[PDB]
Amino acid sequence: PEIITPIITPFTKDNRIDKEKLKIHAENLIRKGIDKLFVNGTTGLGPSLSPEEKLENLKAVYDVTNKIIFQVGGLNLDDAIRLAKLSKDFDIVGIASYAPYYYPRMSEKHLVKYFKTLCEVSPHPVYLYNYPTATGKDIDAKVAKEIGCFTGVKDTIENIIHTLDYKRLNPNMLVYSGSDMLIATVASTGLDGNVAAGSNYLPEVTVTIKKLAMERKIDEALKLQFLHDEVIEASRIFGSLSSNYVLTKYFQGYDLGYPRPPIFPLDDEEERQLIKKVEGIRAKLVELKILKE
Amino acid sequence: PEIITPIITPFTKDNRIDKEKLKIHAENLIRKGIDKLFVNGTTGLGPSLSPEEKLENLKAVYDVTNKIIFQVGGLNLDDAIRLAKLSKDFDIVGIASYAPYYYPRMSEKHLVKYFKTLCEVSPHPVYLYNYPTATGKDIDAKVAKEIGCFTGVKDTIENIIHTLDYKRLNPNMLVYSGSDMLIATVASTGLDGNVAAGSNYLPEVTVTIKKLAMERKIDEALKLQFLHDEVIEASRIFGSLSSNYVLTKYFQGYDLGYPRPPIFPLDDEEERQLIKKVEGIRAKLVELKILKE
Amino acid sequence: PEIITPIITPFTKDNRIDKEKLKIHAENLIRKGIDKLFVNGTTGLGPSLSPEEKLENLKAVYDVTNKIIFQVGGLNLDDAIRLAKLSKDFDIVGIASYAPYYYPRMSEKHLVKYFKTLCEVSPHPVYLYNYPTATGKDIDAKVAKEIGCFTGVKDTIENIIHTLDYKRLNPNMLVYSGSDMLIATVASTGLDGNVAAGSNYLPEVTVTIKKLAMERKIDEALKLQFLHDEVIEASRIFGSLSSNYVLTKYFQGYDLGYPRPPIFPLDDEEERQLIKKVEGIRAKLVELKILKE
Amino acid sequence: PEIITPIITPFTKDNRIDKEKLKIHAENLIRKGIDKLFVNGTTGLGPSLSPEEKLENLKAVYDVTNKIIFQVGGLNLDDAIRLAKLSKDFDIVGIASYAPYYYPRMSEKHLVKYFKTLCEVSPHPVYLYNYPTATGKDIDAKVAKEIGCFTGVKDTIENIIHTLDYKRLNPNMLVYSGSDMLIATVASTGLDGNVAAGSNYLPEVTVTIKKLAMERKIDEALKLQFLHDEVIEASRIFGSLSSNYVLTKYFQGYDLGYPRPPIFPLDDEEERQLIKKVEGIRAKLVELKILKE
Ligand code: NA
Fold it and tell me: Which chain positions lie within coiled-coil regions (chains A, B, C, D)?
């Protein structure tokens, strides 16, 4: 199985993509053993990016690696078609889309047609980005089989039965969980890996959990998994999407600028309280020689 | 109380706003007694529009009437600020925003900061577009009072206790329901009216429900409200946002072009089937002398 | 429309029904203008009562008034049948049942069969007690219509559209809201009334709300509804079912003994906080002459 | 890890417990390798049983084995205390309780008091029966930690994150999933096993999934788990709690009488259609030599 990072989008002081900080982060993730980078996912603030900015994000990461899944979805199908077609000039792993978000009560036929449309124009394998809470709808194992053209799925959901169903119904599909808390479990149970937000700031931990589970050292894998869970919990205090920036700086030692409002940067006091929650975890990982310092 | 139309945005065959069809529709609505038009709401596929298209919508509608509430929200705050400031040259009723959508688990503090930021730059009264199922958030009467700067709210929710609460905690606030099925109830109970998707295609009906209810002819208002409910239920068979275009052409006699995929147009068969589902209702409305024929 | 009290069950110190206190309470409610009494509802802890206790509740209240709807439902259909048959000797308004509670994902067919069974043996009109949050399933207007034998429904739900749908699909049915917050609204919108837990402790207020709305004094009705809402909200702080006992004592001046654990009575600190939250309301109500003192 | 059967309660034609059929079923489960029997759980229709009947169940099963967890909860705390006390004379594994069901919005304080009360009188280890969907509330790992007297938990939820949290926060706690679809995954990821309804009718299957996963044959475990899933799915078509009876007779060759209405028995045709759905699976299980012909 794999750890895939849905990579953060660093914004500059004036709210543009900081390509340079993005490249440094990308380099470090690849050097630290991350398998592939998921660009314009939730953790990257995909829905806050224009189609031009979703391209810019791809271009900057592509400077670093070919190991990219390029998320292209949104509520203008022509823009998503255009991004899909432009990816032909990039030797990447695949493209991806979440389901059309915001609008409730969208018919199954229209959902199926949105994805089939993108499969039809895609120059690369297509991955389903399933995120029921964010998008308002679910594209389950059965709908995924009906759509019929997904090479894999990231299933961001707290229901591993639902994730396992993709495998049951689509035996050849790559099936990833979107949770950081299920890295040990996913590797122990025959799934293909995790697209894990927390691998942005603790790629060493996510990779090591996976490796331990693979080696069948489940009690050691769980012990580390449970530590990782505490950082995830700390990150949710002030809002994970903002907190991920602060944590990457804290644990990896380079700056990733700002998120894009209304995903507001943490303030100094929030940043200080968040660091207070994870410093003893940082010491312990250093003690364990998982983190270098 | 008032009926306010969240007016449909007509698109051409190549996915641009059809300004001329928009004007004809806007003009018909006002002539049939609609109080104000809500521009770039859900019904207008606002989340599917770029900032530039949201402004283009305002301009076209403004040629017809200044009775406009102009929706500006999105996930890039700078763009929404820009729209708010640009509205200064338009003599309109107000601007509006829904909450930042898609991202789950946004802190109250961040949500409050988003709206207060738009209040601080707004040259017009600000309306809260509350839509918990679509955006994943609720900005309830307590949070609206915190924010402190709303002249009004559109509460798109079926729970009228929730909508009444805006009035109870904010006695000076204008309080609208976003439901078509609550027009009779809202008028009878002392609220300010409805921002009703169905008023795009049966504005005569929504205005008459309101009028009957004001006259305390509650049973007559409900009979009409109940017929209107059946049209709303029909519209949901193939997807209401797509169906709204077909129902407008059918009942009002002009077309509104195409929706924007992934809000896909009904096909000829679906259109035939929807028309069959509402034909008998049209006959009833004609016998009630609400519609001509 | 009517105000119906789902009457509290007072329990003695040895966890038996305090029949003498129940009778005093029932007599007060009727004297203060309550139309009918709903026995063994949620508010009376019906699900905590054995079939013998449900019958004991009926006999005590029946010593005071025949204006009773007698709730009989539970997870042993033989017992519910026996209670339904036993009620033949009581000259009352109706019997009632909630849907079989606890078990998830019961088939529509089984739910319909349970209700039709009660209808076949019932010597009185049968009322649907609809409470989806509590029972884990909904018996909506369409399922009610398919069941075909309900004289009325109490709809305890936060969705008045759902409640109105009973009237729309079943025009000869009595349709009540289970909410105290909707007395003004239900009266103005053509519904038949409210089975209002808060009428146990402020029967004066619920009746005056309904009277004001009937007189089309909507603003005054809402002003009083909104004060009543504040008392409902305070009752919920420590748990409404327990707080209903304290509030009855506070506003009506007699006590109702203890609830039945695990519906635990409020402790001293909880009572003090609760009273601080309502005493300024209790003064406004005496000033308005709704309460004596 | 272990498989624990939440054992079915067989009822006679006139709705009493069929003690002799219960004993036959218990003995078979134990002989086929089931580790313990969870008596009066959901699958046994525990909420449908009077305290007396819950005691009859224990005494019947106890004649076969002492490997019993005895579920004693309900909405009359005096009865649950009495049951807990009466278990002193049975040399069993533990007693258990689900949270007080039906009543929504019970304060955490009251929930904690209910379980602490049962712990204080219990002469055996206490197990938490967590089932948020059925009871309307969640007693999560944090609340279980607060209560602080549970020996184990059955987490009937689909979210394995939530289940893993009991072990993360309560290291010495025995932690089981209430899901049949998670047998392979629970065994692989270091949890304690599964309280699996479907082990009533296919104990051979559930014990074999576990064993294969224990031997790290995850591929083979999943294949068999996926077959089992298809039986679980079939049982849900006409209602699992009724269907479990039919499936036990079909797979094990002896009958368990009737369920208790409103958990109605399947009819002859529903039974034929259900058997049609699982015939093909029974065939596979025979080829695989998991079942005898
Ligand atoms: Na009640």
Answer: none
Question: Rounded to the nearest 5°, which phi and psi values hold at A86?
Answer: -65, -30
Nearest C-alpha of chain C: how many angstroms from B74?
28
Residue of B nearest to C171 (CA): B223
Q: Which of D127, D150, D128 is nearest to D138 (CA)?
A: D128
Do the Cβ atoms of B70 and B39 come closer than 8 Å?
A: yes
Would the annotation count C208 as a binding residue? no
Name the structure determination technique: X-ray
**Neighboring chain A residues of D161 at a CB cutoff of 8 Å:** 158, 160, 179, 181-182
Q: Structure tokens of C143?
A: 């399922």
* ω into D125 cis (within 30 of 0): no
Half-sphere exposure of A192 (CA within 13 A, CB side): 20
Beta bridge partners of B194: B3, B177
- Alpha-carbon dihedral sign for residues D268, D272, D278, D284: positive
HSE, CB side, 13 Å, CA atoms: give it for residue C253: 5
CA–CA dist A243, A247 (Å, integer): 6
Domain range list for chain A: 1-293
CATH number at A1-293: 3.20.20.70
Known binding-site residues of B for substrate equal: 42-43, 129-131, 154-156
Tokens of B101: 């959508």
The tokens for B276 are: 């069959």
Half-sphere exposure of A141 (CA within 13 A, CB side): 19
8 Å CB contact between A1 and A190: no
Residue C166: which of C145, C149, C141 has the closest Cα?
C141
Q: How far is the CA of C13 from the centre of ligand 1 (A)?
A: 23
Please tell me the number of Cα atoms within 13 Å of A120 on its side-chain side.
10
D-chain residues within 8 Å CB-CB of C43? none
C229/B168 touch (CB, cutoff 8 Å), yes or no: yes
